[PDB]
Amino acid sequence: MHHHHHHAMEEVTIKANLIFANASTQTAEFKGTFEKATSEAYAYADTLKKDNGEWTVDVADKGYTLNIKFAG
Ligand SMILES: [Zn+2]
Ligand SMILES: [Zn+2]
Ligand SMILES: [Zn+2]
Ligand SMILES: [Zn+2]
Ligand SMILES: [Zn+2]
Ligand SMILES: [Zn+2]
Numbered sequence: 869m870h871h872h873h874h875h876a877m878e879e880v881t882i883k884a885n886l887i888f889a890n891a892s893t894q895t896a897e898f899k900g901t902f903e904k905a906t907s908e909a910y911a912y913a914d915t916l917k918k919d920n921g922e923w924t925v926d927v928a929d930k931g932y933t934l935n936i937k938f939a940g
Contacts, residue, residue, distance in 0.1 A: 870931055878902060883933045884909045888920050889940025902931070909934050 882898045882905040896912055898905040913923045913936050920938035927934060 872902065874901070874903070876901065880905055881932070882906055882909050883929075884912065885933065885935045886913070886916070887935070887937045889938055906931070906934075 878901050879899065880902045882902070884896045884898065886894050886896065896909070898908040898912070900908070910925075913925075913934075916938065917923060921940040923936050923938050925934055925936045
């Protein structure tokens with residue numbers, strides 16, 4: 869699954885749709901290799917944990933979309 873031919877110079881965009889405890893929202897985009905952009909998206913989620921609580925992710929769009937919810 870998620871078949872991927874990797875290339876160091878590959879350019880991709882990972883969309884992170886965030887939903888917070890009070891239901892507020894925002895979308896953040898990360899660019900670079902699929903692996904790096906993916907790593908940066910989760911790193912951003914981690915920075916928001918202190919103020920917004922633990923996060924849960926549901927991957928979609930074959931991995932290009934990360935729907936992340938914060939528990940508060
Ligand atoms: Zn799978
Ligand atoms: Zn190739
Ligand atoms: Zn192939
Ligand atoms: Zn790759
Ligand atoms: Zn690489
Ligand atoms: Zn704070």
